[PDB]
C-alpha cells in the first residue's frame, strides 16, 4: 500500500493548493503560495513515479520543474512588488480596473 500512501500525500498537497485558491479571494499573496503548493505536489508525483517504475525520466523532469518553479516565483513576486508600489496597497479592490 506504499504507492497509494505516497500518492495521497501528494494529492492532499494539490487539493490544499486548490482550496487555498478557493479560500483567499482577498489575499493574492496566498494564492501565489497555493500555486507553489500545487507545483510541489506535482514534483512529488514525478519522483514517486520514477521510483515506482524504476525509471529515471521522472527525476530529470523533477529537477527541471524545480528550475521553472524558482523562475516563476521570482517573476511573480516582482510583479507583486510593482503592483504594490503603484497602488500603495495589495487589496484586491485596487486591481480590478480592467473589466467587461
Amino acid at each position: 500500500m506504499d504507492l497509494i500512501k505516497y500518492f495521497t500525500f501528494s494529492m492532499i498537497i494539490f487539493i490544499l493548493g486548490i482550496w487555498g485558491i478557493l479560500l483567499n479571494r482577498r489575499n493574492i499573496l496566498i494564492m501565489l503560495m497555493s500555486i507553489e503548493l500545487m507545483l510541489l505536489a506535482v514534483n512529488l508525483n514525478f519522483l514517486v513515479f520514477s521510483v515506482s517504475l524504476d525509471d529515471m525520466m521522472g527525476q530529470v523532469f523533477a529537477l527541471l520543474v524545480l528550475t521553472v518553479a524558482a523562475a516563476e516565483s521570482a517573476i511573480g513576486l516582482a510583479i507583486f512588488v510593482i503592483t504594490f508600489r503603484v497602488r500603495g496597497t495589495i487589496a484586491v479592490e485596487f486591481i480590478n480596473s480592467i473589466q467587461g
Binding site: 506504499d2 510541489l40 512529488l44 517573476i75 513576486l77 512588488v81
Partner: protein, 174 residues
Amino acid sequence: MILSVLSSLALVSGLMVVRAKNPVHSVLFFILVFCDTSGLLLLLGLDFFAMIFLVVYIGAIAVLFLFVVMMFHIQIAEIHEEVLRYLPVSGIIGLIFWWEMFFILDNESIPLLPTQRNTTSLRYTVYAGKVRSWTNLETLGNLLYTYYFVWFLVSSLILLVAMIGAIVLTMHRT
C-alpha cells in the same frame, strides 16, 4: 504509520499555509510543508532530492518570499475575509476531487494486502547489481548533461529570463 505521521504533519501545515491570518506565518508554515516533503523523499531513498528541496525551496525560495512579505507590512484588514460561507463550495469541489483522484491509482495499482504470513522470505536478492552501486546523485548526473542536455540548456534560458525580468521590472538605480 510513519507515512501517516508525515501526511498528518503536512496536512496541518498546509492548512495553516492557506488559512493563517498573517502572511508571514503562512510563509513559515510553508517551510514546515517543505521539511515534511524532504522527509518523504528520504523515505523513498532519494537523498539528493531531499537535500535539494531543503536548499532551493527553503534556503532560497522561501527566503525570497519572506523578505518580500516582511517588508510589505501587510495590514490584516486589507486581506481579511470570513470563510464560513465557502464550506459548501469547498465541500463539493474537494469531495469531487477526493473521490476521483485519491483513488485514481486503485484500479491501476491495486494494493497488496498484508497477510499473516512472512512474505519477506520471498524477496529475491540479485547480488550482481550490488557490486558497484550508484548514488542518486551520480545516476542523475549521468543523464543531465549528455543524453538530455538540451532541456538543461532551455532551463538556463528560463533562468536568464528571470534575471532580466527581475531587473527590468523593479530596478530604480540611485
